[PDB]
Amino acid sequence: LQKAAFRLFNETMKEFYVLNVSGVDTRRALQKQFGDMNHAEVYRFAEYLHLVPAFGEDPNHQTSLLHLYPHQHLVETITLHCERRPNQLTQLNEKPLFPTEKVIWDENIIPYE
Amino acid sequence: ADLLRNIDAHYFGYLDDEDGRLIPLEKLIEEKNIERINKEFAEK
Amino acid sequence: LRSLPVTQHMRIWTLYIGFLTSHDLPETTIRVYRRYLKMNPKAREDYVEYLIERDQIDEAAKELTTLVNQDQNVSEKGRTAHQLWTQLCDLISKNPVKIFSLNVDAIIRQGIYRYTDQVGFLWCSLADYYIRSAEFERARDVYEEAIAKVSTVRDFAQVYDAYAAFEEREVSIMMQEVEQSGDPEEEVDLEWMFQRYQHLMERKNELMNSVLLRQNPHNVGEWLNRVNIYEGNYNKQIETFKEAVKSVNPKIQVGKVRDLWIGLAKLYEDNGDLDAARKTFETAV
Amino acid sequence: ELLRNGRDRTEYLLVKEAKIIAMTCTHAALRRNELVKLGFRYDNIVMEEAAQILEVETFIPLLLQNPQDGHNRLKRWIMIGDHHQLPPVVQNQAFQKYSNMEQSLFARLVRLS
Amino acid sequence: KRTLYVGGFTEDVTEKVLMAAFIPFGDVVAISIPMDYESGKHRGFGFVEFDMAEDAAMAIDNMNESELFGKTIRVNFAR
Amino acid sequence: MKDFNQRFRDLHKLRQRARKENHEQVVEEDRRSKLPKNHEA
Structure with a gap:
């Protein structure tokens, strides 16, 4: 994805392609990069990702596509597509096995009974 | 001493012979030794 | 062994192991040695030395962890835990393709938390572990994290020097690939590498100064170097002032905070943002 | 005669002498870590009352031994039970009724035909 | 070296029993078991003299801590 | 391409x-x- 940003998007994505992936794939890093990018350019990047229909050349169709997929909608979808998944086993191994008082009683979380 | 609490069925090798895959490897090294002693004895 | 008293087995084991270790029988010798170590646990240091010589690196590592988990004051070869653990990283980090059983990265970061004398070395050890594994993008992540987590200049100078040398290696390899290939898309991958490499050099001043601002971010002088490092990036100069002037505590300040307030207001005033300049004088008071 | 500690005599008996080993599903969950450490090996599971055992506690007896290779060495699994009699006694209403923890593995496999 | 101190045997062990236990590692020509006059029993220890020190070494190394009647008998160099 | 070698020479210098x-x-x-x-006091 950075290799493609170097070819295609270059001037608009200078931070994305030039950093390391962990500097680039966190939820904050994606929202910063694509939140600051111009709306038509975030769409082109989503278009590269095959998230959205081809933007084409007709300015009217373009305006409908930008209207159908607004800026914050793209950034959230690009973020969901690109962000680092958490490895659930690392979070799982961090937990204890015994429940504590905060877990044995969890009153507002247990209407289950 | 304190080794006696550590000796067990594993130490005496009751729990180490269900596998048996060692024997083909041992056979390979074993035959090279047989030829090696034969060659050393050949000049005697 | 079954036939004789257990107390006579030392007269047998020294032959049994001595016979086995004279031959290229690693799979058999492993099973016999782990039996022997139940009666003579002192021999585990010699078992490790055997395993290394037979390239049983994955087993040599496991037995080293047992020697380290046995937190002896000194081992039966005169090595303390801080020596035995240093062996474990030398054996681990240089053998990534073979060390398959241990969680290597979890060992080396756990060292850094514990061996604060040599943090700058261990980050290269962890990164070099991935470089030998050819996981070049994990290698970058370790270096780029290290530069963000290292907390002395002495340790940063090692990591950054290593990371710059690592980048130059990859560019050198990739550059030759284009010089042989001539392919136009490979050359685009080469120039991408140059942007990456050149950018890391450009960060040098910023990263060095940032390390000092984790030693003592009451050092208002280093916030003024931080501002000058962004000279011409008018926005980031203002942003790091707004970081600076809240991060410093005046009571132990080195230099004094009044240089920041007047400096920031002067920066606005020099650029004609006099309302913001006044605003910073107001917040200053 | 070689193993004179009372513990070792039971460990030899458990791993080498006995051919039929009998254990409640509850106790199989407790003793797993010991049995795996002892190199306990078994080739056949027979379960009775399999419709009353929890899905979880039915599964654990499959894994009371290390795999000797890239694959397991279990040869037979016999489940004897009756899914038309009562389920395992899951007693929280939600975890019983919503998450269907009241389904034993015997009942689940019968529903799988 | 040729003189051994023998210790740790049970009350059942007579001098011929030690003779039967020690000639396994060389020629034994005498054994002595000092007896405690107050109890009328031996003190659990005895001396062995060998004709060769090498035999006494093959008798310390291979009788020391050896089991006799299920007890670990101790065999050692008389100081 | 000599362009790259000239650029690479400056980066190594840098x-x-x-x-x-x-x-x-x-x-x-x-x-x-x-x-x-x-010392500061």
């Missing part, structure tokens, strides 16, 4: 410069670390 400059900052810290905390 790396070597940064190699030295880092060492200057390290030796400076030693005096400051040697200097006591009371």
Whole structure:
């Protein structure tokens, strides 16, 4: 994805392609990069990702596509597509096995009974 | 001493012979030794 | 062994192991040695030395962890835990393709938390572990994290020097690939590498100064170097002032905070943002 | 005669002498870590009352031994039970009724035909 | 070296029993078991003299801590 | 392509410069670390 940003998007994505992936794939890093990018350019990047229909050349169709997929909608979808998944086993191994008082009683979380 | 609490069925090798895959490897090294002693004895 | 008293087995084991270790029988010798170590646990240091010589690196590592988990004051070869653990990283980090059983990265970061004398070395050890594994993008992540987590200049100078040398290696390899290939898309991958490499050099001043601002971010002088490092990036100069002037505590300040307030207001005033300049004088008071 | 500690005599008996080993599903969950450490090996599971055992506690007896290779060495699994009699006694209403923890593995496999 | 101190045997062990236990590692020509006059029993220890020190070494190394009647008998160099 | 070799030569030069400059900052810290905390007072 950075290799493609170097070819295609270059001037608009200078931070994305030039950093390391962990500097680039966190939820904050994606929202910063694509939140600051111009709306038509975030769409082109989503278009590269095959998230959205081809933007084409007709300015009217373009305006409908930008209207159908607004800026914050793209950034959230690009973020969901690109962000680092958490490895659930690392979070799982961090937990204890015994429940504590905060877990044995969890009153507002247990209407289950 | 304190080794006696550590000796067990594993130490005496009751729990180490269900596998048996060692024997083909041992056979390979074993035959090279047989030829090696034969060659050393050949000049005697 | 079954036939004789257990107390006579030392007269047998020294032959049994001595016979086995004279031959290229690693799979058999492993099973016999782990039996022997139940009666003579002192021999585990010699078992490790055997395993290394037979390239049983994955087993040599496991037995080293047992020697380290046995937190002896000194081992039966005169090595303390801080020596035995240093062996474990030398054996681990240089053998990534073979060390398959241990969680290597979890060992080396756990060292850094514990061996604060040599943090700058261990980050290269962890990164070099991935470089030998050819996981070049994990290698970058370790270096780029290290530069963000290292907390002395002495340790940063090692990591950054290593990371710059690592980048130059990859560019050198990739550059030759284009010089042989001539392919136009490979050359685009080469120039991408140059942007990456050149950018890391450009960060040098910023990263060095940032390390000092984790030693003592009451050092208002280093916030003024931080501002000058962004000279011409008018926005980031203002942003790091707004970081600076809240991060410093005046009571132990080195230099004094009044240089920041007047400096920031002067920066606005020099650029004609006099309302913001006044605003910073107001917040200053 | 070689193993004179009372513990070792039971460990030899458990791993080498006995051919039929009998254990409640509850106790199989407790003793797993010991049995795996002892190199306990078994080739056949027979379960009775399999419709009353929890899905979880039915599964654990499959894994009371290390795999000797890239694959397991279990040869037979016999489940004897009756899914038309009562389920395992899951007693929280939600975890019983919503998450269907009241389904034993015997009942689940019968529903799988 | 040729003189051994023998210790740790049970009350059942007579001098011929030690003779039967020690000639396994060389020629034994005498054994002595000092007896405690107050109890009328031996003190659990005895001396062995060998004709060769090498035999006494093959008798310390291979009788020391050896089991006799299920007890670990101790065999050692008389100081 | 010679363009790349000329560019790469300057970056190595720049790396070597940064190699030295880092060492200057390290030796400076030693005096400051040697200097006591009371020195500011």
